[PDB]
């Protein structure tokens, strides 16, 4: 219970003090009992809080702080041209910790390598952000949007038509968060 | 008498119950707002402009809720039981005086009336806990009853010490007797014991661990019964407000405002019939108070039956509210006490001190020729 | 989790799995999602397996 | 809030606007207009408030939503 | 039964006379308990159906001729007995041991070749 | 028609103003539900008071991974909620299984056990997100016709 | 660059138990106070009940 | 003691008459209120 | 598999993923850079403060003191802003990874932690104003849940459950890991082995963790926060988009993963709830052959019968809170 070698210098406790060896005057000792002085001090600390500013935020008018690295709902982005950035490498499908991504790809009419299916089970996803660390083209991101509770969980099966619609909606904020964090990525 | 008694009976009863009920509703909002300032948050501030409707929506929600309590083998008990628990809560307000004699019932045995209505509280904690089906929780309703009866002895034995000083069980006489001095000053330790006894009597935290442990042993098969009922909540809040008014009646002034009109008499000595009202003081001058406009009006309003009654009730209200704060502050300041430890506090600390003071107080009143007369004076 | 049996143990009962659970999940022949699933049956008024 | 703060903001926004805020935000708050959303929402800023309260929104719709 | 009401310290059968003695005592306790299992778990079956179904679960392992295999089969029984006699198993686990409260019922394998062929392997 | 509508609005105002949730803090999402009671986001200011008993409650918030061993007690507690009843599923684990979806011990969604009215996404949702879900539910109740449905039939 | 400390290092923060004794809660000043309050009250009560008894002689 | 002065604690301060009032009616004048600084 | 460790003790996330990283790094035979060593020891103590704010204040909320809980959850609310700045999660960071940390800390964070540091002791002191000398608090924890030093060892107790019975022992001092051998801190050891000792030992760790965080701020060295080897840690995005070798190493790390050499290791750290350890068998491949988590609370709850025997039920609720118990830890 103590380490090997010599016992620690004064590890052993002093002998216990008898009641009449204690250094506390009866006046101090009896007063603290009947006046309940330590409980009075704690009640006074609550008066101090009473007259301090509160911590509360009025939501939804005032929001809490979120960093550029925040991990909210997924979005599929484009280039300035308008083409989808996604080229169907499937890296985000391989690294998914919860197997939430299902991708089916083929050759587009023009010969380009593009996805035909892009589904994200929002009820399987753990919001780790791994999908967006593995992208070679910044195609999949997680927007700062955390406010999308829905009614049915069928609404939480995002298909490629919803994830592109999300990127079109959120692009300025997505481009801004990428601009802030890119040096660190 | 100028008009019919039944009308007079009705107006005084409505004038006490409707303000008392509206007040019992705002103590619930107030206890959530006060605990939030001390906990650096906000209380209710959304149901109503300043959260002033929070009590209303809480009460109407419960009223509209389904109730699934057992109606079998006991139909009256499920329905007519808690209803009279709420009657036994409001029946104590009928002896509160809002000025000399200004009570629904001016009762000579007013104190023994509020000792009777209090011993009926034990039934509203015993019987409700009889509905819940869980072995350990039922024993927790007996332990809460045991706490109430023990802390009732604390209150009745310490009310005794006030009666010795006043000579009467009339709440009006008890307050009028404090015109000499508030009983907090000479019976300091009796007041503290009474306030501590009054928290334990209401089953309030930090003395609520017995009824607290029911929620922790409910299990996976049964549940409580105080569910959709606002009765045992209005019975609870109204007993806290009532224990604050009675605490003020006995130890603070009651409705006694420390009158500054005595101070101005002592200081002022340059009475002038021309209305100047010069004062013989160091910050004094020759005031220009308007005799035709102000002094004639001010003097009349001071002697009005409405104004003087108003100050007597604002005094009692300000004093009850200060004590309502001290109950809310106590709940937010301490952890809970175990049932055996509260029992030791009552039986081996508090009551020994009280019985020691029951000997000493009449002994001093005899030694200084200060036994009051027990005839109707004051 | 494995089915190994400890002679001398007082009260060697399951600690992690459900009450009528059959199988030892950390065995490598045991499948990841198991063999059974549960749901609430409206017609039977209980959870069924 | 506190009386000094709520008094000063009445001297700024007026009693008709004071009641508008009690109905929605539940606070008396004054700040500079920063801009308008396409949805019609209005944004205000005040470096002098409590932290995380320097920016707020006045929504355009009665049945507002984040 | 020191830590729990029906706990039995894990023991290793010394020989077949001992191992058969334990099996019979296990079967005896189970079929004794069947009325107590049928009220607690509100089993909508006769006590006779419960007892005949308990018998089947011992009838499965009647041909085990390994002594190391019997002890694990005995420990499994003792543990099942403990979690049923203490109200630890839910009615859902208990009346799911009866393999007719499936909405497909007891008939869940195909009866013969042709009926399973016309239904696509059941 | 107006009169029955008023009866609804008042009834809905009180189902909204007093919002008492019974809770099943199964795992981490409960921590984030505890941060909804702390000073930065306080539930009390909006009238939310978490009650222990199902009898005193309005809404169940399943917050955490539901396991096969825990599911009978989820259904028992929901079966004890007096009407009207609402359920919020909070987090990926309760919504659809989440990280433990492909496991032998986890129910893949709490709606295989009970009916759900709002699903809040995230592992864990932020405290704002769970607030957003409560406002969606509070809006669902404001659109609940009680005495105006009885009138059409 | 990276997120680095200031050149001279950050200053020391307060981390030890502070908890400083105040006279408001020490027993001796409170015992003395409660005593003077009860003595003043007992002088005021002994004067009042004497006057009350004299008012009763006049009433009778 | 173990305390360091409030003036080095990176929290909002009370000013003027309210500072004098606070440094009178408070257990530890060197204690902060935990409110961070906006700038 | 690293995000699985955030969800074990869900109030102490970055120290759960620290013990998994340290185990994998030991089989990888790699030395992680000094900056990540200090980042990990700083955020391991920010984590220890976060857990103790949950554990101490929830314990007192069960005992019936309700106000310290709310005060320190603003302190908790402020310290989760630092989690969400380094990562984007208020709870499950996934920040600590084999080979260091996922991303470098942002460029104004070490100033913001120092600003929080200047006032955090005052928060402990006011939390301590309410509980330490309070007689109701004292009379609900003295003599409750008393374990002898010999039995705490025989019962597999670690941490303050071990340390509150008078055994001086901290994994940080006895098997130093990360930058703990570079920081000066003390170890609170109790006397009477009861809940009051374990409360007083936990409050002292508040002040000791703050004392480490300040030292970490002043020794923060420069350099990679990630092991400088792309066969193990992901290359920068800019490299992957510019250099051939980097895209190959990026691609294979996110699909196959890195191979860990064969062998097994048992690795323990001083987690906030006791000793947390993992046994990892490696098969030389890219997936773990066997991961076993040793959870401090699992051993603590196993000794609840031996410790609560003869006590009252109101006593047992106090014993539940003095044992730092999150059931996602206990059941893995
Ligand atoms: C011992 C008792 C006190 C212990 C707690 C510690 C008190 C403390 O630290 O005080 C310093 C503290 C300094 O705080 P601050 O952040 O500098 O406030 C500056 C603001 O300008 C202050 O803005 P403001 O508008 O709050 O201040 C002006 C004015 C505004 O209020 C009024 O004029 C009336 C308000 C009450 C009536 C309406 C309802 O408030 C007062 O002057 C106090 C009025 C309320 C006193 C009684 C409160 C209930 C008890 O002062 C107070 O907040 C109150 C002073 C102490 C009051 C004790 C009673
Ligand atoms: C005297 C003390 C109580 C005054 C109440 C005045 C009415 C009131 O609160 O107005 C706001 C109320 C409305 O309050 P509310 O509850 O709708 O406030 C909603 C605020 N948010 C959106 C943040 C939840 O105004 C009315 O509609 C008047 C109702 C009168 C009812 C009877 C009183
Ligand atoms: C505003 C301020 C008051 C607000 C409410 C305060 C409520 C205080 C309740 C405290 C109860 C504590 C308790 O249960 O007992 C503590 C104790 C008596 O028990 P004991 O076994 O002697 O313990 C010795 C060490 N405390 O010690 C005591 O409590 C005895 C102190 C005497 C009580 C007052 C008597 C008149 C002076
Ligand atoms: C309340 C706030 C106002 C009082 C304290 C204000 C203050 O700062 O007073 C100065 C001093 C504080 O304590 P001290 O440590 O001496 O301060 C050193 C400063 N250089 O103040 C003091 O030293 C004196 C503080 C007052 C002590 C006597 C109080 C008596 C109150 C009436 C009797 C109450 C007793 C009964 C209590 C019953 C409780 C159950
Ligand atoms: C002990 C509590 C003592 C309470 C105070 C008693 C007191 O002051 O008695 C004063 C009394 C004279 O009566 P009083 O109405 O004050 O004055 C009449 C006009 N001179 O005169 C007396 O009765 C004299 C009192 C002398 C004894 C005082 C207490 C001694 C023991 C302590
Ligand atoms: P007779 O001499 O003909 O037979 C005696 C035995 C059977 C011992 C044979 O002689 C024999 O040697 N057979 C091999 C040994 C053997 O039987 N091994 C296994 C014994 S343990 C066993 O069979 C356990 C069965 C399951 C126990 C639980 C049953 C009930 C569970 C469900 C109840 C209903 C729902 C709650
Ligand atoms: C108007 C007549 C009465 C009709 C019914 C009115 C509603 C009655 C119940 C509400 C009254 C206040 O009741 C009290 O509310 C607070 C929340 O503010 C609860 O407090 C709860 O949440 C707060 C939130 O910070 C926690 O600090 C506290 O630990 C917790 O218990 C109390 O557990 C409850 O007892
Ligand atoms: C000594 C003189 C006394 C004069 C004043 C006497 C007043 C007596 C009024 C009795 C009214 C009923 O008394 C009161 O009942 C309610 C409901 O049963 C109890 O309240 C009970 O239910 C509520 C919930 O609804 C709980 O929050 C509370 O903890 C519990 O104890 C109070 O604990 C009790 O004080
Ligand atoms: S989003 Fe990125 S990682 Fe996923 S398939 Fe498309 S290109 Fe590959
Ligand atoms: S954030 Fe969600 S979708 Fe992306 S990799 Fe992680 S679990 Fe899969
Ligand atoms: S959804 Fe995420 S945070 Fe919530 S319980 Fe599941 S793993 Fe924990």
I221 contacts: CB under 8 Å, gap ≥ 6? I34, I35, I38
**G2 to chain H, minimum CA–CA distance in Å?**
22
Which atom number of ligand 1 is nearest to the Cα of residue H15? 17
Distance, in Å, from the CA atom of G54 to the CA atom of C33, rounded to the nearest integer, reads 95
First-residue to last-residue Cα distance in chain I: 13
How many domains in chain E?
1
G-chain residues near I107 (CB < 8 A): 2-3
Chain breaks in chain H (C to N over 2.5 A) after: none
Distance, in Å, from the CA atom of I223 to the CA atom of I30, rounded to the nearest integer, reads 16
Query: How far apart are the CA of B239 and the centre of ligand 8, in A?
Result: 5
CB C15 within 8 A of CB E79: no
Query: A92, A57, A61, A150: which is closest to F122 by C-alpha?
Result: A150
Helix (H, G, I), strand (E, B), or coil: what is residue I256?
coil
Distance, in Å, from the CA atom of F128 to the CA atom of A122, rounded to the nearest integer, reads 18
The DSSP bridge partners found for residue D45 are D32, D55
Distance, in Å, from the CA atom of I206 to the CA atom of I190, rounded to the nearest integer, reads 15
Query: How far apart are the CA of A27 and the centre of ligand 5, in A?
Result: 27
Does any CB of chain H come closer than 8 Å to the CB of residue G11?
Answer: yes
Which ligand is in closest contact with the Cα of D62?
2
Chain breaks in chain A (C to N over 2.5 A) after: none
Is A92 assigned to a binding site? yes
Distance, in Å, from the CA atom of I97 to the CA atom of I226, rounded to the nearest integer, reads 9
**F133-139 contacts, C-beta under 8 A, 24 or more apart:** F133/A149, F133/F88, F133/F90, F134/F19, F134/F48, F134/F88, F135/A60, F135/D65, F135/D66, F136/A149, F136/A151, F137/F59, F137/F86, F137/F88, F138/F16, F138/F19, F139/D63, F139/D65
The β-bridge relationship of strands F59-63 and F86-90 is parallel
Q: Which protein residues are within 6 Å of ligand 9, measured from CB?
A: A 86-92, 103, 134-135, 137, 139-140
Q: How many beta carbons lie within 10 A of that of residue B311, not counting itself?
A: 14
CB I92 within 8 A of CB I7: yes
Helix or strand run (H / E) with residue F25: strand F21-25
Query: How far apart are the CA of I287 and the centre of ligand 10, in A?
Result: 19
Helix (H, G, I), strand (E, B), or coil: what is residue F59?
strand
The DSSP bridge partners found for residue D35 are D43
CB A20 within 8 A of CB I112: no
Distance, in Å, from the CA atom of I115 to the CA atom of F27, rounded to the nearest integer, reads 32
The β-bridge relationship of strands I263-271 and I274-282 is antiparallel
Q: Which protein residues are within 6 Å of ligand 4, measured from CB?
A: A 35-36; B 192; G 22-24, 29-30, 33-34, 37; H 24-25
Query: I3, I328, I41: which is closest to I209 by C-alpha?
Result: I41
Does any CB of chain A come closer than 8 Å to the CB of residue H33?
Answer: yes
Distance, in Å, from the CA atom of I301 to the CA atom of I161, rounded to the nearest integer, reads 11
I287 contacts: CB under 8 Å, gap ≥ 6? I257
What is the residue with the minimal CA distance to atom 13 of ligand 2? B48
Q: Which protein residues are within 6 Å of ligand 3, measured from CB?
A: A 33-34, 36; B 189, 192-193, 196, 326, 330, 337, 341-342, 344-345, 349, 353; I 135-136
Distance, in Å, from the CA atom of A117 to the CA atom of B238, rounded to the nearest integer, reads 65
DSSP assignment of B314-327, as one string? HHHHHHHHHHHHHH
DSSP assignment of I88-150, as one string? S-SS----EETTEESSPPPTTHHHHHHHHHHHHHHHHHHHHHHHTS-HHHHHHHTTSS---HH
Nearest to B333 among A46, A52, A56 (CB): A46
Query: I245, F122, I255, I95: which is closest to A134 by C-alpha?
Result: I255
Among chain I residues, the shortest Cα distance to A128 is held by: I94
First-residue to last-residue Cα distance in chain H: 30
CB F94 within 8 A of CB F29: yes
In sequence order, what E strands does chain I have?
96-97, 100-101, 263-271, 274-282, 290-294
Query: How far apart are the CA of F50 and the centre of ligand 4, in A?
Result: 40
Residue A127 CB–ligand 10 contact under 6 Å:
yes
Q: How many beta carbons lie within 10 A of that of residue I164, not counting itself?
A: 30
Is A135 assigned to a binding site? yes
Does F95 sit behind a cis peptide bond, omega within 30 degrees of 0 on the bond before it? no
In three-state form (DSSP H/G/I as H, E/B as E, the rest C), the secondary structure along chain A is CCCCCCCCCCCCCCCCCCHHHCCCCHHHHHHHHHCCHHHHHHHHHHHHHHCCCCCCCCCCCCCCCCCCCCCCCEEECECCCCCECCCCCCHHHHHCCCCCEEEEEEECCCCCEEEEEEEEECCCCCCCCHHHHCCCCCCEEECCCCCCCECCHHHHEECHHHHHHHHHHHHHHHHHHHHHHHHHC
Name the phi and psi angles at B15, rounded to 5: -70, -25
Query: I145, I163, I155, I67: which is closest to I317 by C-alpha?
Result: I145
Query: B305, B257, B316: which is closest to B96 by C-alpha?
Result: B316
Answer whether F132 sits within 8 Å of A147, measured CB to CB: yes
What is the residue with the minimal CA distance to atom 44 of ligand 1? D3
Nearest to B45 among D19, D23, D26 (CB): D26
CB I113 within 8 A of CB I82: yes
Give resolution, Å, one decimal: 2.8
Distance, in Å, from the CA atom of I104 to the CA atom of I81, rounded to the nearest integer, reads 16
Helix or strand run (H / E) with residue I307: helix I304-308
C-alpha pair distances (Å), A136 with each of A82, A99, A133, I245? 18, 20, 8, 14
C-alpha pair distances (Å), I178 with each of A119, F58, I31, I293? 41, 49, 10, 20
Query: B359, B350, B347: which is closest to B146 by C-alpha?
Result: B347
G-chain residues near B371 (CB < 8 A): 49
Neighbours of chain A (3+ CB pairs under 8 A): B, D, F, G, H, I
Chain breaks in chain E (C to N over 2.5 A) after: none
Name the phi and psi angles at A149, rounded to 5: -60, 145
A-chain residues near H26 (CB < 8 A): 48
B-chain residues near G36 (CB < 8 A): none
Among chain I residues, the shortest Cα distance to H7 is held by: I118
Task: Choose one of A118, A126, A146 to mutate for the ligand 10 pocket test, by most ligand atoms within 8 angstroms of C-beta.
Answer: A126
I214 contacts: CB under 8 Å, gap ≥ 6? G10, G12, G13, G15, I114, I117
F-chain residues near B46 (CB < 8 A): 17, 45-47
CB I106 within 8 A of CB I86: yes
Distance, in Å, from the CA atom of B4 to the CA atom of I2, rounded to the nearest integer, reads 85
What is the residue with the minimal CA distance to atom 4 of ligand 9? A92
Q: How many beta carbons lie within 10 A of that of residue G60, not counting itself?
A: 8
Residue D4 CB–ligand 1 contact under 6 Å:
yes
Answer whether F46 sits within 8 Å of B226, measured CB to CB: no
Note down the domain range covering E19: 1-122
F-chain residues near I76 (CB < 8 A): 35, 38
What is the residue with the minimal CA distance to atom 10 of ligand 7? B28
CB I49 within 8 A of CB I111: no
DSSP assignment of B181-216, as one string? --TTTTTHHHHHHHHHHHHHHHT-TTS-HHHHTTTT
Give the number of residues written for chain D.
66
Distance, in Å, from the CA atom of B67 to the CA atom of B81, rounded to the nearest integer, reads 15
Query: I1, I9, I3, I65: which is closest to I330 by C-alpha?
Result: I9
Q: How many beta carbons lie within 10 A of that of residue C37, not counting itself?
A: 13
Q: How many beta carbons lie within 10 A of that of residue F44, not counting itself?
A: 22
Answer whether A48 sits within 8 Å of H27, measured CB to CB: yes
CB F135 within 8 A of CB A60: yes
Distance, in Å, from the CA atom of I262 to the CA atom of I242, rounded to the nearest integer, reads 34
Residue E85 CB–ligand 6 contact under 6 Å:
no
CB I33 within 8 A of CB I293: no
Which ligand is in closest contact with the Cα of I63?
7
Distance, in Å, from the CA atom of I39 to the CA atom of I18, rounded to the nearest integer, reads 11
- Eight-state DSSP code of residue B349: I
């Amino acid at each position: 219970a103590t380490p090997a070698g010599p016992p620690p210098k004064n590890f052993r406790l002093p002998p216990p003090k008898n009641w009449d060896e204690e250094s506390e005057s009866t006046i101090d000792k009896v007063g603290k009992y009947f006046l309940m002085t330590e409980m009075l001090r704690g009640m006074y600390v609550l008066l101090e809080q009473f007259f301090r500013p509160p911590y509360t935020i009025y939501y939804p008018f005032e929001k809490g702080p979120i960093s550029p690295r925040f991990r909210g709902e997924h979005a599929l982005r484009r280039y300035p041209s308008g083409e989808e950035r996604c080229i169907a490498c499937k890296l985000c499908e391989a690294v998914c910790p919860a197997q939430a991504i299902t991708i089916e790809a083929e050759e587009r009419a023009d010969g380009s390598r593009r996805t035909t299916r892009y589904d994200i089970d929002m009820t399987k996803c753990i919001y780790c952000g791994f999908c967006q660390e593995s992208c070679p083209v910044d195609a999949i991101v997680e927007s700062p949007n955390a406010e999308y509770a829905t009614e049915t969980r069928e609404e939480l099966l995002y298909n490629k038509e919803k994830l592109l619609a999300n990127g079109d909606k959120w692009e300025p904020e997505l481009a801004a968060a990428i601009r802030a964090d890119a040096p660190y990525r | 008498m100028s008009y019919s008694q039944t009308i007079n009976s009705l107006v005084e009863v409505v004038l006490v119950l409707v303000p008392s009920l509206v007040g019992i509703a705002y103590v619930t909002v107030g206890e959530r707002k006060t605990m939030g300032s001390m906990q650096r948050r906000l209380g209710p501030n959304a149901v109503g402009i300043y959260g002033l409707l929070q009590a209303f929506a809480d009460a109407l929600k419960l009223l509209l809720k389904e109730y699934v309590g057992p109606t079998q083998a006991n139909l009256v008990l499920f329905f007519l039981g808690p209803v009279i628990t709420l009657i036994f809560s409001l029946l104590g307000y009928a002896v509160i005086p809002y000025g000399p004699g200004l009570a629904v019932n001016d009762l000579s045995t007013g104190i023994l009336y509020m000792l009777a209505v209090s011993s009926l509280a034990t039934y509203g904690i015993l019987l409700a806990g009889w509905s819940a089906n869980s072995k350990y929780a039922f024993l927790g309703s007996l332990r809460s009853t045991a706490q109430l009866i023990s802390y009732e002895l604390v209150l009745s034995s310490s009310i005794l010490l006030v009666i010795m000083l006043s000579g009467s069980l009339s709440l009006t006489v008890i307050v009028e007797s404090q015109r000499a001095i508030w009983y907090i000053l000479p019976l300091l330790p009796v007041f503290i014991i009474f306030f501590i006894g009054s928290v334990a009597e209401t089953n309030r935290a930090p003395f609520d661990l017995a009824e607290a442990e029911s929620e922790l042993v409910s299990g996976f098969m049964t549940e409580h019964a105080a569910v959709i009922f606002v009765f045992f909540f209005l019975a609870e809040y109204g007993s806290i407000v009532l224990m604050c008014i009675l605490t003020s009646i006995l130890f603070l002034g009651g409705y006694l405002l420390i009158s500054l009109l005595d101070i101005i008499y002592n200081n002022l000595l340059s009475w002038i019939v021309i209305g100047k009202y010069i004062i013989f003081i160091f910050p004094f001058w020759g005031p220009v108070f308007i005799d035709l406009g102000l002094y004639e009006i001010i003097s009349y309003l001071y002697n009005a039956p409405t104004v003087e009654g108003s100050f007597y009730g604002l005094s009692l209200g300000v004093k009850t509210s200060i004590l309502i704060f001290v109950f809310i502050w106590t709940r937010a300041s301490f952890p809970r006490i175990r049932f055996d430890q509260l029992m030791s506090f009552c039986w081996t600390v508090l009551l020994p001190i009280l019985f020691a003071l029951i000997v000493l107080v009449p002994c001093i009143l005899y030694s200084f020729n200060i036994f009051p007369v027990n005839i109707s004076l004051l | 989790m494995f089915g190994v049996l400890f002679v001398g143990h007082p009260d060697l009962r399951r600690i992690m799995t459900d009450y009528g659970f059959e199988g030892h999940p950390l065995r490598k022949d045991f499948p990841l999602t198991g063999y059974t699933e549960i749901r609430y049956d409206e017609e039977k008024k209980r959870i069924v397996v | 809030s506190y009386p000094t703060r709520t008094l000063a903001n009445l001297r700024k926004i007026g009693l008709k606007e004071y009641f508008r805020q009690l109905l929605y935000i539940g606070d008396t708050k004054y700040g500079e207009l920063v801009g308008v959303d396409k949805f019609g929402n209005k944004f205000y800023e005040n470096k002098e408030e409590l932290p995380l309260r320097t920016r707020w929104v006045d929504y355009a719709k009665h049945d507002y939503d984040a | 039964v020191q830590p729990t009401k029906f706990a039995v310290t894990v023991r290793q059968s010394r020989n077949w006379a001992d191992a058969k003695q334990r099996v019979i005592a296990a079967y005896r306790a189970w079929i004794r308990a069947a009325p107590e299992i049928q009220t607690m778990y509100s089993i909508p079956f006769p006590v006779s159906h419960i007892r005949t179904r308990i018998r089947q679960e011992f009838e499965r392992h009647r041909y085990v001729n390994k002594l190391n295999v019997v002890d694990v089969l005995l420990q499994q029984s003792n543990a099942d007995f403990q979690e049923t006699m203490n109200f630890w198993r839910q009615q859902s686990h208990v009346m799911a041991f009866f393999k007719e409260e499936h909405f497909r019922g007891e008939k869940r394998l195909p009866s013969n070749f042709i009926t399973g062929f016309l239904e696509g392997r059941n | 028609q107006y009169a029955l509508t008023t009866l609804d609005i008042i009834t809905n105002w009180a189902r909204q103003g007093s919002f008492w949730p019974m809770t099943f803090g199964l795992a981490c999402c409960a921590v984030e539900m505890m941060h909804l009671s702390t000073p930065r986001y306080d539930q009390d200011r909006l009238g939310i008071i978490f009650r222990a008993s199902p009898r005193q409650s309005d809404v169940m918030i399943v917050a955490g991974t539901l396991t096969n061993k825990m599911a009978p007690a989820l259904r028992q507690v929901y079966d004890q909620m007096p009407d009207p009843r609402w359920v919020i599923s909070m987090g990926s684990c309760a919504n659809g299984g989440g990280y433990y979806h492909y496991s032998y011990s986890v129910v893949r969604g709490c709606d295989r056990i009970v009916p759900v009215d709002v699903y809040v996404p995230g592992c864990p949702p932020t405290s704002e997100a769970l607030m957003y879900g409560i406002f969606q539910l509070q809006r669902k109740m404001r659109n609940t016709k009680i005495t105006r449905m009885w009138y059409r039939k | 660059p990276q997120d680095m400390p200031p050149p001279g290092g950050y200053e020391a923060v307060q981390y030890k138990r502070n908890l400083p004794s105040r006279g408001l809660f020490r027993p001796r000043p409170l015992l003395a106070g409660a005593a003077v309050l009860m003595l003043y009250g007992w002088y005021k009560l002994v004067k009042g009940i004497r006057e009350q008894n004299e008012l009763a002689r006049e009433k009778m | 003691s173990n305390a360091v002065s409030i003036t080095k604690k990176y929290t909002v301060q009370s000013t003027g008459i309210w500072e004098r009032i606070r440094r009178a009616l408070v257990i530890d004048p060197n204690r902060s209120n935990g409110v961070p600084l906006n700038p | 598999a690293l995000p699985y460790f955030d969800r074990l003790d869900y109030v102490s996330m970055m120290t759960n993923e620290q013990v998994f990283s340290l185990a994998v790094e030991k089989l990888l035979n790699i030395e992680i850079p000094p900056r990540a060593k200090f980042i990990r020891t700083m955020f391991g103590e920010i984590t220890r403060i976060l857990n103790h704010l949950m554990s101490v204040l929830s314990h007192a909320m069960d005992v019936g003191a309700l106000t310290p809980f709310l005060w320190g959850f603003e302190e908790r609310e402020k310290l989760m802003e630092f989690y969400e700045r380094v990562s984007g999660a208020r709870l499950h960071a996934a920040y600590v990874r084999p080979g260091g940390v996922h991303q470098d800390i942002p460029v104004g964070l070490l100033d913001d932690i120092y600003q929080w540091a200047t006032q955090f002791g005052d928060r402990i002191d006011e939390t301590e104003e309410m509980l330490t000398d309070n007689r109701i608090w004292i009379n609900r924890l003295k003599g409750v849940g008393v374990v002898s030093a010999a039995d705490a060892l025989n019962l597999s107790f670690t941490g303050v459950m071990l340390r509150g019975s008078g055994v001086p022992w901290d994994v940080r001092k006895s098997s130093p890991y990360d930058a703990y051998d570079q920081v000066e801190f003390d170890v609170p050891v109790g006397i009477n082995g009861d809940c009051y000792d374990r409360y007083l030992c936990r409050m002292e760790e508040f002040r000791q963790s703050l004392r480490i965080i300040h030292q970490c701020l002043n020794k923060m060295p420069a350099g990679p926060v990630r092991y400088e080897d792309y066969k193990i840690t992901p290359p920068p995005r800019a490299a992957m988009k510019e250099n051939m070798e980097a895209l190959i190493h990026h691609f294979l790390l996110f699909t196959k993963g890195y191979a860990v050499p064969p062998g097994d290791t048992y690795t323990a750290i001083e987690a906030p709830k006791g000793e947390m350890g993992v046994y990892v068998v490696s098969d030389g491949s890219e997936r773990p052959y066997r991961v076993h988590i040793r959870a401090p609370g699992f051993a603590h709850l196993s000794g609840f019968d031996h410790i609560t025997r003869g006590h009252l039920l109101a006593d047992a609720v106090a014993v539940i809170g003095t044992m730092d118990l999150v059931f996602g830890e206990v059941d893995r």
